[PDB]
């Protein structure tokens, strides 16, 4: 629990350009770990905000025409500022609109972490038309998808699922913490993207240990919240998750973390 | 509890074009019953999304110029795709801006359910019990009508039913009624003329869950009620449903 | 607890033009005290809504080009309707974009209450004839001739010939996004269409909110910022005069 202590003490300003369903929950989850969220979407204030921020999250869950040019512009402003970007290509596999936009974004800017579920990351890389020799209709595992994506974008890849996978440089790790109740809370994965942004501390090429810790804090909090005697389902789980992020300590972290290399 | 079982197993993709105050809660409510919510507002992806979706909710609670043309366009896309529309004309009686828009929408697309409170549905058909209003509206639009109130009324074809479940705490949670629109969408399974039994089950699941949540020892008011509602939707079983449902045919 | 009884009985329509992170919580908080929130942002319906509303909140937390001109237009519609405006210049000190906009709004329209933290209000008054919150609030009052509410560890209100300091609340409030945003809404709920509100209304609004927060954080089921938020809403819903009078902490009153 190294980096979480620093979040709690430093209160990193974490800019979130995220979807309209999850803004409150993402901001609350960032506040619970001690970060300082700001949902700023105006390009007119990006240069000022970004100079003093520690990371930017771009999540395209409710992407519309209102957002497209602005997201590209701020991504470029983040690059120029040296502000690391976490990119969550929500539902990219569901439409050509989203596929085209994500391709455009990742041709326009260097991001620092790309985070999605297996189907999202597979759709990204399938659309690239680069993966000569790979059958995409075959049942590719998340580790394989993550390493292929890493080869394409040379950017840390985080694939969420029953087990989570992180690939950064030549290290790949698999994490096995969490709760099924997380899929039953709409902001959960989207919040994770914001939590990962919270752990970056302005590092454009984050250490894999930061990413391991971000994902593990979230998932272990979830596991603990779901065990709480007052957790009665996905509704009461959400407040308990935030409480459990707020209170998570090193002892619980170390006792619960389930990680495997390769 | 027939249709709920199907939602739980089949995880129906339910598209929601809804208001800015209730997106999260609507999504969460749909997740608690097993549905798969998607708050897609871009007309550019409607054709692709709608081909695989089971229903569309259109709720105009926070209608602005940004939304107007897009809502008309997606309603037409839904019609073309055979995707049933649930329409919630939130606060239509409060402004000529809303009244004009709702009139334009209902001249531009066939919807599958129109849901509102008595004043909303009255405003639609005007510009007085709920049963009478609902039947008049049904005559005009030839679409299922759900009027929420102390008692809820459903009219579909030549059948009208009154349901008497719920809690007073629902009125103190913003977007309770908005979420009920989404739950109704979740029960449609791509039927553009839904069975009245599906509509009865959608409203009853919601209002029985509300009743039961408000009886929970840990319900201390409208704040704690909302998490408990979601828990209760997640846990609702047939035994509770059948013991608690209060329905009368008109 | 005079005004709160009235809000519970009369159910004042309270229009909120507020930021995207806090809409749901703001509406729920207004519902909890018995107000009727409406998050109407369309200028096309402002004249009709405002004739029957009791107040308007304008909060610029998520200000973008989409909002700028609409906010100016609706503020003018409110002024023409006699509808009091509560203005929350969220993070105005953080960008020239927000500073310039707040300067434009306040030139264009008269508001009834300006609510912010000390850094926000200080940023508003920064380019003027020219440290503690009371001093900042009095300077702002001299410039805008409008009630000023400065939130902080202790809250300050200045209106008319009086300045007061209040000392209620919980540290868990800072860990709930939009607690302060919801407070702006609660203040709007206490206005009852008075464009020059009585300081007693403002004191009651802030005190109801912060006393509820204190009480909710003492609840045995409050385990952190997540469970606190539901309990805050429950405690606003149930707050009574006895608790109010026993807990209110008014620290200083000047003039
Ligand atoms: C976290 C945030 N970003 C924009 C507005 N908000 C809520 C007020 O802090
Ligand atoms: C339910 C929904 N629609 C667009 C975004 N979201 C939140 C979860 O991705
Ligand atoms: C509170 C409000 N303003 C616009 C929509 N909503 C939520 C449904 O009442
Ligand atoms: Mg996701
Ligand atoms: Mg309605
Ligand atoms: Mg609805
Ligand atoms: Mg504030």
Numbering used by the authors:
A (entry chain B): 1 to 262
B (entry chain C): 1 to 127, 140 to 262
C (entry chain A): 1 to 130, 140 to 264
Sentences from the paper on this structure:
Here we report a detailed structure-function analysis of the kinase ThiM, which phosphorylates THZ in one of the first steps in vitamin B1 biosynthetic pathway. The quaternary structure of SaThiM is a triangular homo-trimer with dimensions of approximately 72 Å on a side and 47 Å thick with three independent active sites, each located within interface regions between two monomers. The following β-sheet strand 7 is antiparallel to strand 6 and following β-sheet strand 8, which is antiparallelly flanked by β-sheet strand 9. This fold of the phosphotransferase ThiM is homologous to that common to the group of ribokinase-like folded kinases. The three active sites, each located within the interface regions of two monomers respectively, are homologous to other known phosphoryl transfer ribokinase-like kinases.
Out of this in silico selected set of molecules, two were chosen as the most promising analogues for further investigations: 2-(1,3,5-Trimethyl-1H-pyrazol-4-yl) ethanol, hereinafter referred to as compound 1 (cpd 1) and 2-(2-Methyl-1H-imidazol-1-yl) ethanol referred to as compound 2 (cpd 2). The structures of these complexes could be refined to 1.87 Å and 1.62 Å resolution with R and Rfree values of 16.86% and 19.90% for the cpd 1 complex and R and Rfree values of 18.24% and 20.28% for the cpd 2 complex. The thiazole moiety was replaced by the non-sulfur containing heterocycles pyrazole and imidazole for cpd 1 and cpd 2, respectively. For both compounds the N3 is retained and a second nitrogen atom at position 2 and 5 is included in the heterocycle of cpd 1 and cpd 2 respectively. The overall coordination of the THZ analogue compounds in the active site regions of the ThiM trimer is remarkably comparable to that of the of natural substrate THZ. Both compounds form a H-bond to the amide nitrogen of amino acid M39 and show a similar orientation of their hydroxyethyl groups. The activity of ThiM was analyzed in vitro, as described in the methods section, showing that the specific activities of cpd 1 and cpd 2 are approximately 1.5 times higher compared to THZ, however show only 1/10 of the efficiency (kcat/KM) in comparison to the natural substrate THZ. The two novel compounds applied for co-crystallization in this study lack the thiazolium sulfur, present in the natural thiazolium moiety of thiamin, which is replaced by a carbon atom, supporting slightly higher flexibility in the active site in consequence of the reduced van der Waals radius. Cpd 2 has an additional nitrogen atom in the heterocycle and could, like cpd 1, undergo a TPP imino tautomerization after fusion with HMP. As a result this substance could be channeled via thiaminase (TenA) into the bacterial thiamin pool, where it could act as a thiamin antagonist equally potent as pyrithiamine.
